Amino acid sequence: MQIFVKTLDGKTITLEV
Structure with a gap:
């Protein structure tokens, strides 16, 4: 997932998990 x-x-x- 990318947000x-x-x-x-x-x-x-970038906010990545």
Whole structure:
């Protein structure tokens, strides 16, 4: 399973299990 998350500060990283 693949699920993406983004922040208003300036960061990009994938959430995987």
